[PDB]
C-alpha cells in the first residue's frame, strides 16, 4: 500500500480524478494510491505513474500525444494504462516538467520514447510524433541505467558510464561542441573517462546537468540567468565543471524552468538560475548565477527533491515536505495561492511519512512506501 497525494493545477484533470481546478491542499488520490506506485513523474499538465508490477499509467492533457495512449488530442481524466508497454517491466519514466515527450526505461535496459517528436527529441532519426511509445533502436546494444528529458532534448546514460544526448542542438544543450540538432542519440565524447551517474535536462533555452561517481557536477547548454552555475550568463556546448559544488557530495541533480537544483548526501540543497517568482527558495526573486545553499533548510536533512516549472518540493528524513516558489495554481500546498518566497512546510500531510516527491508544470505529488 503506497498512499499518493496530489495538488496543484487540475484544469486538464492532470491530478487524476479530483474536482476543482486549483487543488490548494495536498489531496489523497484514490486512483494513484490504488496503482501501488514506485515512481510518479510530472510533465506539462501531465502525470505518469510506474507501478510495482512495471506498468505505466498516464493522465492529463493528451495534446501532441504526450501521454503515449495512442490518442493525441483531448484529456484523460482518470489514470489509464499505457498498453504499448505491457510486455515490458518499466523501471523509470523520464519527462520534463514543461515537456511534451517522455521516455521510459525498462529493467532489462531498453528505452522507449513517445510524444512530441520535434527536433528529433524522441530519438528516431526523425522529427515525427509518436502517439504510442517506440523503442529507441539506436541504443539497443547499450545497457541503459538512467534517462532524462528536457523540453526539446533528451538524454540517456549507460551502466558503463557513457552519456548519450539527442534532440534540439541549439545553444549547445547536447554537449557535442557545436549547436547541431542530433536526430539520433550521440555520445558526449568530452565526458568519457568520467563515470556519469545522473543527468538532468532543462526546457526552452535549456541547460543540462551531469554528475559523476566522484561527485563532480558538469553543466552546459544555454546560460541565461546563470543557470550553468559558473557566473554571468554565457552558454557553452562543451560540459564544464561547476567548481563550487566540488567536494560537496552532490547526489541528485534536477533542472526546473531556467534553474538548476542539486541535493547533497548530507541533505543540503543548492539552487541557482532564474530567480523570478521565487523558484529558487532564497526569499527573493533575483537570479542566482553561482550555486547557493537554500538557507531555509539549513539543518533539515533533505533526502529527496523535485522541481517543477516554478516550484520545488523537498522531503526531510522524517517524512516532512517543504515547498517554495510560485502558487498561481495551489501547487505550493499551503492552502492558498500565495507565493512561498522561502521553503514552507506543506499542509495536511501529518502522519504521512512521505519518502518521494515529484512535480509537473504546475502540479505536485507526494507519496510513501
Amino acid at each position: 500500500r503506497t498512499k499518493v497525494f496530489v495538488w496543484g493545477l487540475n484544469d486538464k484533470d492532470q491530478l487524476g480524478g479530483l474536482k476543482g481546478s486549483k487543488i490548494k491542499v495536498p489531496s489523497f488520490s484514490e486512483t494513484l494510491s490504488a496503482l501501488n506506485v514506485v515512481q510518479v513523474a510530472g510533465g506539462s499538465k501531465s502525470l505518469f505513474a510506474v507501478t510495482v508490477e512495471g506498468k505505466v499509467y498516464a493522465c492529463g492533457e493528451a495534446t501532441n500525444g504526450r501521454l503515449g495512449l495512442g490518442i493525441s488530442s483531448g484529456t484523460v481524466p482518470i489514470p489509464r494504462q499505457i498498453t504499448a508497454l505491457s510486455s515490458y517491466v518499466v523501471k523509470k519514466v523520464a519527462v520534463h516538467s514543461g515537456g511534451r515527450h517522455a521516455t521510459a526505461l525498462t529493467v532489462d535496459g531498453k528505452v522507449f520514447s513517445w510524444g512530441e517528436g520535434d527536433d528529433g527529441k524522441l530519438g528516431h532519426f526523425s522529427r515525427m510524433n509518436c502517439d504510442k511509445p517506440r523503442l529507441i533502436e539506436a541504443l539497443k546494444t547499450k545497457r541503459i541505467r538512467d534517462i532524462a528529458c528536457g523540453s526539446s532534448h533528451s538524454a540517456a546514460l549507460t551502466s558503463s558510464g557513457e552519456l548519450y544526448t539527442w534532440g534540439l542542438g541549439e545553444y549547445g544543450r547536447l554537449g557535442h561542441g557545436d549547436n547541431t540538432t542530433q536526430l539520433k542519440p550521440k555520445m558526449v565524447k568530452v565526458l568519457l573517462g568520467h563515470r556519469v551517474i545522473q543527468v538532468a535536462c532543462g526546457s526552452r533555452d535549456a541547460q543540462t546537468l551531469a554528475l559523476t561517481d566522484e561527485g563532480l557536477v558538469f553543466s552546459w547548454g544555454d546560460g541565461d540567468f546563470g543557470k550553468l552555475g559558473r557566473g554571468g550568463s554565457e552558454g557553452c556546448n562543451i560540459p564544464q565543471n561547476i567548481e563550487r559544488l566540488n567536494g560537496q557530495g552532490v547526489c541528485q541533480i534536477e533542472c526546473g524552468a531556467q534553474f538548476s537544483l542539486a541535493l547533497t548526501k548530507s541533505g543540503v540543497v543548492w539552487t541557482w538560475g532564474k530567480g523570478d517568482y521565487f523558484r529558487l527558495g532564497h526569499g527573493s526573486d533575483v537570479h542566482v548565477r553561482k550555486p547557493q545553499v537554500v538557507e531555509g533548510l539549513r539543518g533539515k536533512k533533505i533526502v529527496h527533491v523535485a522541481v517543477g516549472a516554478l516550484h520545488c518540493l523537498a522531503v526531510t528524513d522524517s517524512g516532512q515536505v517543504y515547498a517554495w516558489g510560485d502558487n498561481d495554481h495551489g501547487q505550493q500546498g499551503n492552502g492558498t495561492t500565495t507565493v512561498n518566497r522561502k521553503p514552507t512546510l506543506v499542509q495536511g500531510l501529518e502522519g504521512q511519512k512521505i519518502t518521494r516527491v515529484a512535480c509537473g508544470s504546475s502540479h505536485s505529488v507526494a507519496w510513501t512506501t
Binding site: K12, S44, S203, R204, Y277, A309, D326, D328, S361
Partner: peptide, 9 residues
C-alpha cells in the same frame, strides 16, 4: 510575461 508559466481554464 513569463513564458514557462502554465495557465488555467
Amino acid at each position: 510575461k513569463d513564458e514557462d508559466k502554465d495557465e488555467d481554464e
